[PDB]
Amino acid sequence: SMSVKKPKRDDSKDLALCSMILTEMETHEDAWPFLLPVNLKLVPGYKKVIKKPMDFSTIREKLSSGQYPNLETFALDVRLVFDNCETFNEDDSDIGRAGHNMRKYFEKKWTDTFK
Template sequence: IEYPMDLFTINSKLENNQYTSLKEFEKDIRLIFCNCYTYNDIKSKEYCSGKILESIFNEKWNE
């Protein structure tokens, strides 16, 4: 994975006010999904869970 990202890092960036825009936050969240699909086999539970979580994120993000 060329650009790793995880929820701990995102939380830390939020706590330290390192995001200057919502777009930056969204980019990091989407990077997690991208890395999930790159690293895990399409038939794995991790890949499928990533798809479900991404769907929920998209729904909430677009509200």
């Protein structure tokens, strides 16, 4: 509260570490459905159904331009990618399986790096 602060958790490396995680996700073989924004002109249903589209290229631009205030807003956008994937894709599809695999991959890097 006013003039009463919990000790300072060191966040000075968070930008570099989020950038390394994102590089690892960009280079995973199963990242292909997630590298670029879904083409809203060419994929029926996507625009209406998926209220907040998100992809790795968009996260990379946001990260590079100071548009994440902290590491939790970064993780929210990464999870949004996989939450969107589950909304639109059957679990038993190549894309559906890719999204489960990538979410698993992310969450381990997240825990190992920050927790």
